[PDB]
Every structure is written in C-alpha cells, then in structure tokens.
Design a protein around this nucleic acid. Structure first.
Length: 149
RNA sequence: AAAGAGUUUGAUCAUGGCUCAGAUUGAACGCUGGCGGCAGGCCUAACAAUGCAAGUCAGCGGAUAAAGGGAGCUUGCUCCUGGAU
C-alpha cells in the first residue's frame, strides 16, 4: 500500500524507580486507493522510529474492501468498544464528509463519497477498528442467496 | 420545476461535564470617515408642548344688490328690466 497516512501520535509514559520513562505511540493507516487498507500501531522512544513501526504493521494485516466504485456499498453501522460508527453512500459530488480518524481510513480505501459519522467514543484507535469492521463486512454480489437480486 | 478539537491521569481506556471553531440578529458598544442601490429602524415605560377625516348648493337664510340694460344727479352717486356670479 502506497498512500500511507498518519492519524495520531501520542506521548505515553511509564513509571520506574527513577521516574517517567517515555515512549511514543503512532496510529497510522495504509492504503492503495482501490479497496485495500490496513491500519497499524507501533511504539518507540522517538517519534519517527514509531511511525515506521506503524507503517510496518499496517502493510501487513490489510483487507480487501468490497466497494461499489468510489462509494460505499450500503449504509452501514459498526462498533468496537464504546466507539460507534455509521457510514453510508453519497451520490457523486460529495467528498469525505466524515472526519478525523474515519477520514483517513475512508480515504486510503479509495472511497470518496462517504458521509460517515461517529458516536460514542471519539478515541481514534477504536474509531479506526470501528471503521475497519464496517469495511471488512460488506458484499455487493457475494450474497449466497442464490438469486440475481 | 450530517466532519470535530481542548481539558480529570505518571500513562490508559471508559463514563461524564465544561470550553471552542460554526451559522444567525430590529442588535449594542469599541475603534474611520468613499459611494450607490434596495431595505430596515423605541425590543425598554410610561406623561405629553405644538402642527392630520369632510365632503355634497341637489334645503333655507344670508352676501352680491353683476360688468350688462337703464333712470336720477352726470360718470362721484343710490334704486333698478333684472339682480348675476
């Protein structure tokens, strides 16, 4: 995936006898604009050594998203933890009218007509799982109900 | 014919409040002074100086007593055929 994109970077800490030892955590999304997306988390003592690990772990664990072509397939809802994410299609002139951590995942999947909205928790590491489960769980023609519709 | 940020922790996730960016207004107020068009203008409390509703002459009575036509004096003058308007 080649349109990588960082979302959030957080300075987290740990106490020992001496005091707070620090480490930076970066959450980063990796896509190709065609329906392939992973997300990755990594930690290091320095910022770019953790972004790299977030790039690394997001190039594995990537997923084929069964889109319709530049939009979502149907209006969908998903949730991981207290984070809850509603996503739908838009028509043709709309862009990414979602926002934040959902704006990155629904940019590097190559969708550009979203109209997504998140409720509950806005913590981006769970909003990213909650967008990731909405996208992993669609199907346009792979209904096993043996019909044409 | 539909976007979120900031802030409780040594760090975390959650619950939850606050704060913010936004659009509006019969606006006030702080800073200046170019214009035009179209609008809008006591949201508050009442007491009021001084200047806007009246037309129809088809109803009498007043006024004019036409200029005119005279008359008397003679163009000063009053009554008149009529007496207007």
């Amino acid at each position: 995936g080649y349109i990588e994109k960082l979302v959030q970077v957080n300075r987290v800490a740990k106490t020992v006898k001496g005091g707070r030892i620090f480490a930076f955590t970066a959450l980063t999304v990796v896509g190709d604009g065609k329906g392939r997306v992973g997300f990755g988390r990594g930690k290091a003592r320095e910022v770019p050594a953790a972004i790299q690990k977030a790039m690394e772990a997001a190039r594995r664990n990537m997923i084929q998203v069964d889109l319709n072509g530049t939009t979502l397939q149907y209006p969908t809802k998903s949730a991981h933890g207290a984070s809850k994410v509603y996503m739908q299609p838009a028509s043709e002139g709309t862009g990414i009218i979602a926002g934040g951590a959902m704006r990155a995942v629904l940019e590097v999947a190559g969708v550009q007509n979203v109209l997504a909205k998140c409720y509950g928790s806005t913590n981006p590491v769970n909003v990213v799982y909650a967008t990731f489960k909405g996208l992993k769980n669609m199907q346009p023609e792979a209904v096993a109900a043996k019909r044409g519709k």
